[PDB]
Design an enzyme around this catalytic site. Structure first.
Site, mmCIF file in Angstrom:
data_model
loop_
_atom_site.group_PDB
_atom_site.id
_atom_site.type_symbol
_atom_site.label_atom_id
_atom_site.label_comp_id
_atom_site.label_asym_id
_atom_site.label_seq_id
_atom_site.Cartn_x
_atom_site.Cartn_y
_atom_site.Cartn_z
ATOM 1 N N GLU A 238 0.792 -1.227 0.000
ATOM 2 C CA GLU A 238 0.000 0.000 0.000
ATOM 3 C C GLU A 238 0.817 1.266 0.000
ATOM 4 O O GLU A 238 1.918 1.295 0.611
ATOM 5 C CB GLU A 238 -1.001 -0.028 1.164
ATOM 6 C CG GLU A 238 -0.538 0.401 2.525
ATOM 7 C CD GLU A 238 -1.699 0.586 3.550
ATOM 8 O OE1 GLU A 238 -2.529 -0.338 3.755
ATOM 9 O OE2 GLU A 238 -1.721 1.634 4.220
ATOM 10 N N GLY A 405 3.593 -8.857 11.073
ATOM 11 C CA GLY A 405 2.683 -8.607 12.247
ATOM 12 C C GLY A 405 1.230 -8.737 11.813
ATOM 13 O O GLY A 405 0.957 -9.023 10.654
ATOM 14 N N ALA A 406 0.298 -8.517 12.745
ATOM 15 C CA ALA A 406 -1.107 -8.715 12.482
ATOM 16 C C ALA A 406 -1.918 -7.810 13.402
ATOM 17 O O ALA A 406 -1.448 -7.485 14.510
ATOM 18 C CB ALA A 406 -1.446 -10.151 12.795
ATOM 19 N N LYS A 424 1.688 -14.175 6.336
ATOM 20 C CA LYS A 424 2.336 -12.990 5.866
ATOM 21 C C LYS A 424 3.850 -13.235 5.571
ATOM 22 O O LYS A 424 4.330 -12.722 4.576
ATOM 23 C CB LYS A 424 2.044 -11.771 6.811
ATOM 24 C CG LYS A 424 0.637 -11.199 6.503
ATOM 25 C CD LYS A 424 0.185 -10.378 7.672
ATOM 26 C CE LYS A 424 -1.245 -9.832 7.492
ATOM 27 N NZ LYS A 424 -1.400 -8.973 8.717
HETATM 28 C C1 0GA Z 1 -1.602 -4.358 3.902
HETATM 29 C C2 0GA Z 1 -2.786 -4.731 4.752
HETATM 30 C C3 0GA Z 1 -2.600 -5.703 5.675
HETATM 31 O O1 0GA Z 1 -1.271 -6.309 5.755
HETATM 32 C C4 0GA Z 1 -0.516 -6.184 6.908
HETATM 33 C C5 0GA Z 1 -0.875 -5.472 8.049
HETATM 34 C C6 0GA Z 1 -0.027 -5.352 9.156
HETATM 35 C C7 0GA Z 1 1.251 -6.012 9.136
HETATM 36 C C8 0GA Z 1 1.678 -6.731 8.016
HETATM 37 C C9 0GA Z 1 3.014 -7.441 7.907
HETATM 38 O O2 0GA Z 1 3.309 -8.035 6.810
HETATM 39 O O3 0GA Z 1 3.720 -7.408 8.929
HETATM 40 C C10 0GA Z 1 0.779 -6.855 6.867
HETATM 41 O O4 0GA Z 1 1.181 -7.499 5.751
HETATM 42 C C11 0GA Z 1 -3.631 -6.163 6.641
HETATM 43 O O5 0GA Z 1 -3.393 -7.149 7.367
HETATM 44 O O6 0GA Z 1 -4.627 -5.460 6.871
#
Ligand code: 0GA
EC number: 5.4.99.5
Length: 435
Positions: A238, A405-406, A424
């Protein structure tokens, strides 16, 4: 500037990365490669470097370091220095740390001395690689010659990758998530993104890894760099902020996650689930509204608009719900003020932002540095392009690691959150090429 036509069977990602490898090796220089709308821009060598830390601003050119104190907003200090770099050259490149975003929420006092906030350089040379051609801006004989040599010999074949186990939890991500869930239950904030690092026990080849992961990711931006002792690469899902020379600002929040890359039949039912799922939709709607409120702080009155709302964005190992939000930059504001308004991204911090960012200082490994900050490209005409740093590998000193992360909400479970960080990490863990 001169130009060379693109060879026939050759993907511009593989070429641009081979160039970064071979050429910048031969001359032993730092570089940052940034992919932005079908152009792979290689910023090669450091003409001059702006280093913004929590306690100091430095500019380094030709062996000389000018040091300055700074107070006020970090984007004002950074902005002044980068504006000067851009009197000399048409574009500047670098990275911005998660930490750059904490001043706005009243957390500057938590940063330790010498915490990096930003590194932005002007390049000595740029090489732009697209489907159609290679353009060269200020390449010396020694660079032109090495490029000639690369074209002559061709791109290396990417070897088989070496694998990493991500299923351990040494930093207690599960325990940490549970603390966040309790805090959310007691009404402390609505949502926070926690993360975990994974150590890579062998040295990786950053350009070849970059090439391999790029065939399995569909990013909005991507990057490969070696700068000041950091190596990094990533696929950014993004845009956190783009500012155009005509004053149009864009941000593109994603929120809501399904698995993808599991094969067409599985990935269709996950999409249909995604688009109609109450829990995914609510969290997207909430992020849209936060980022609209952020953009309104730098926007000409009434110019803030959602131009793409809640549609499926495909990102390699995951698919997400995405929207695009647009505004006109207010004449009383500037591109750095726009970036601070939208930083850290909602997507990788939390809601409300002051409480979410603060929970990250307590419940994650800090500083985050590059992870959840941005990789940036800035233009003399006033442009800014800032990609959100996720799905990245780093090497600093003799340590190589990944980080993912999440988002944790009230209903979150530690086991399932850990599984989300696996999915991820999967966007990169199958593609690491050992050095
Ligand atoms: C781009 C949108 C998202 O991706 C991420 C959010 C928070 C962390 C990560 C990550 O890869 O650590 C992620 O890919 C989502 O989980 O909403």
């Amino acid at each position: 500037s001169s130009s060379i036509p693109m060879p026939a069977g050759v993907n511009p990602a593989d070429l641009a990365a081979e160039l970064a490898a071979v050429v910048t090796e031969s001359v032993d220089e730092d570089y940052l490669l940034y992919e932005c709308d079908g152009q792979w821009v290689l910023a090669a060598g450091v003409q001059a470097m702006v280093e913004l830390d929590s306690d100091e601003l430095r500019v380094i050119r030709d062996g000389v370091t000018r040091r300055q104190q700074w107070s006020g907003r970090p984007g004002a200090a950074l902005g002044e220095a980068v504006d000067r770099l851009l009197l000399e050259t048409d574009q500047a490149f670098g990275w911005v740390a998660f930490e750059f975003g904490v001043h706005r929420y009243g957390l500057q006092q938590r940063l330790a001395p010498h915490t990096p906030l930003a590194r932005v350089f002007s390049p000595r040379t740029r090489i732009m690689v697209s489907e159609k051609e290679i353009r060269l801006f200020d390449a010396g004989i020694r660079h032109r010659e090495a490029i000639d040599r690369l074209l002559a010999t061709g791109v290396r074949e990417v070897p088989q990758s070496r694998s990493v186990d991500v299923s351990d939890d040494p930093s207690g991500f599960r325990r940490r998530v549970a603390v966040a869930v309790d805090e959310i239950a007691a009404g402390r904030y609505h949502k926070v993104i926690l993360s975990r690092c994974v150590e890579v026990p062998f040295a990786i080849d950053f350009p070849l890894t970059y090439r391999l992961g790029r065939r399995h990711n569909t990013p909005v931006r991507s990057f490969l760099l070696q700068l000041g002792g950091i190596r990094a690469l990533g696929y950014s899902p993004e845009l956190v902020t783009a500012v155009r020379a005509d004053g149009v600002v864009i941000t593109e929040p994603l929120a809501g996650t399904r698995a993808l890359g599991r094969g067409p039949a599985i990935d269709r039912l996950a999409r249909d689930d995604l688009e109609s799922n109450s829990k995914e939709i609510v969290e997207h709607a909430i992020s849209v509204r936060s980022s609209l409120e952020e953009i309104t702080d730098i926007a000409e009155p009434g110019s803030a608009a959602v131009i793409d709302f809640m549609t499926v964005r495909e990102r390699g190992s995951v698919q997400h719900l995405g929207s695009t939000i647009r505004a006109r930059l207010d004449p009383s504001s500037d591109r750095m003020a726009a970036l601070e308004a939208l930083f850290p991204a909602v997507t990788a911090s939390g809601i409300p932002k002051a409480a979410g960012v603060e929970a990250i200082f307590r419940l994650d490994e800090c500083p985050r540095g590059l992870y959840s900050g941005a990789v940036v490209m800035l233009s003399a005409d006033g442009g800014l392009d800032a990609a959100l740093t996720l799905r990245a590998a780093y090497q600093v000193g003799g340590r190589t690691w990944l980080r993912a992360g999440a988002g944790i909400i009230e209903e979150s479970e530690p086991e399932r959150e850990f599984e989300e960080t696996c999915e991820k990490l999967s966007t990169l863990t199958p593609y690491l090429v050992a050095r």
